[PDB]
Amino acid sequence: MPQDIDFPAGISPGLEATRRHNLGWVRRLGLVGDGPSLAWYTSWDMPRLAACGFPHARGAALDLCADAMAFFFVFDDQFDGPLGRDPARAARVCRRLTGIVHGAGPGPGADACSAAFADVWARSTDGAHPGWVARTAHEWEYYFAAQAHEAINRLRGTPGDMESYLQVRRGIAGTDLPLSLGERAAGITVPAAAFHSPQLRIMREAAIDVVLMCNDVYSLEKEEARGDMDNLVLVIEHARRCTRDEAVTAARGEVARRVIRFEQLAREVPALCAQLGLSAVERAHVDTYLGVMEAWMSGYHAWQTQTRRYTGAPHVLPSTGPGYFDEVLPT
Numbered sequence: 001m002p003q004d005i006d007f008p009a010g011i012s013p014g015l016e017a018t019r020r021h022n023l024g025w026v027r028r029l030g031l032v033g034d035g036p037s038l039a040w041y042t043s044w045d046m047p048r049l050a051a052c053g054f055p056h057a058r059g060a061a062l063d064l065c066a067d068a069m070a071f072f073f074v075f076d077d078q079f080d081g082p083l084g085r086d087p088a089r090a091a092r093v094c095r096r097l098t099g100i101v102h103g104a105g106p107g108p109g110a111d112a113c114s115a116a117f118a119d120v121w122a123r124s125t126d127g128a129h130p131g132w133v134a135r136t137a138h139e140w141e142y143y144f145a146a147q148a149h150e151a152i153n154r155l156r157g158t159p160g161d162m163e164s165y166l167q168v169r170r171g172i173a174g175t176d177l178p179l180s181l182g183e184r185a186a187g188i189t190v191p192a193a194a195f196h197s198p199q200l201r202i203m204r205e206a207a208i209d210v211v212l213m214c215n216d217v218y219s220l221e222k223e224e225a226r227g228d229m230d231n232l233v234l235v236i237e238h239a240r241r242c243t244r245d246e247a248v249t250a251a252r253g254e255v256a257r258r259v260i261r262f263e264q265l266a267r268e269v270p271a272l273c274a275q276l277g278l279s280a281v282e283r284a285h286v287d288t289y290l291g292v293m294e295a296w297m298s299g300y301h302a303w304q305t306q307t308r309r310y311t312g313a314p315h316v317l318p319s320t321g322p323g324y325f326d327e328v329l330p331t
């Protein structure tokens with residue numbers, strides 16, 4: 001049981017203000033309607049996810065974090081239905097979103113997902129360093145393009161091997177986008193010389209893996225009944241021919257060894273900055289980047305233990321029907 005499994009240095013003070021902003025935003029954009037969908041959305045507590053996962057974000061930066069999360073979660077659930085069993089259709093819908101990434105704004109009257117994404121993306125890139133924009137644009141492309149491969153795997157009905165699981169799951173989980181968002185919301189720019197160090201590249205990959213694997217464990221109940229295949233627990237069980245409990249234990253171990261690797265490498269970061277001759281301001285941005293990665297790991301988990309999304313989904317949206325009350329994504 002998820003309540004019996006365990007794997008924040010702060011919480012953003014803007015939580016309550018962002019709750020108010022984000023409630024108006026999802027309704028204004030058409031991303032969340034009224035009634036069941038609104039109560040269900042509210043029960044996820046996207047503001048607390050933003051405030052725990054991005055504690056460096058203040059003011060309008062935290063608003064952006066919560067709106068981005070709102071997009072991720074609402075868009076994600078649109079595939080818990082016929083769309084997630086139709087890879088060609090999923091690929092076409094996600095090509096629409098990808099065009100927004102690379103410059104083709106959707107125009108007035110676009111669907112709610114396209115309009116919400118375009119707003120998040122415009123706010124994200126406004127004033128951002130061009131190196132951040134290029135990298136994050138490609139991160140978005142991977143996220144959108146990976147959804148159809150999850151659908152392919154659902155039709156296959158067997159989990160992939162570990163390598164193929166990671167390739168699909170890292171994409172559909174949002175790849176490095178949460179860390180790009182946290183960097184942007186903290187107002188920092190990681191110097192490229194530090195960003196591409198072996199230590200920080202390994203740490204970034206480890207942090208993203210830790211969070212998606214923690215999600216795999218806690219979201220297994222709602223996913224397994226829908227025929228989802230890109231979940232670490234299912235992958236381990238299938239590869240090892242072990243019991244469910246043995247697979248959960250192994251999944252905890254995949255998380256733990258990555259946290260250990262991350263923390264071992266984090267100890268080298270001061271020396272790395274000195275070897276590169278980074279300025280004091282550059283070193284301060286690297287230090288904040290370390291905190292951003294640390295807070296995504298600890299803050300995501302703090303959120304998922306109190307949200308109603310995972311305990312509630314099997315009861316309010318059973319696997320015998322779609323995983324949404326309203327269609328907001330035209331296919």
Ligand SMILES: CC[N+](CC)(CC)Cc1ccccc1
Nearest residue numbers: 072073076173174211212215
């Ligand atoms: C990033 C938000 N996400 C994935 C797109 C929305 C469903 C859930 C998630 C959070 C953290 C790790 C993995 C997945």
Ligand SMILES: [Mg+2]
Nearest residue numbers: 076077172173
């Ligand atoms: Mg998903």
Ligand SMILES: [Mg+2]
Nearest residue numbers: 076077080219
């Ligand atoms: Mg999902």
Ligand SMILES: [Mg+2]
Nearest residue numbers: 215216219223
């Ligand atoms: Mg999940």
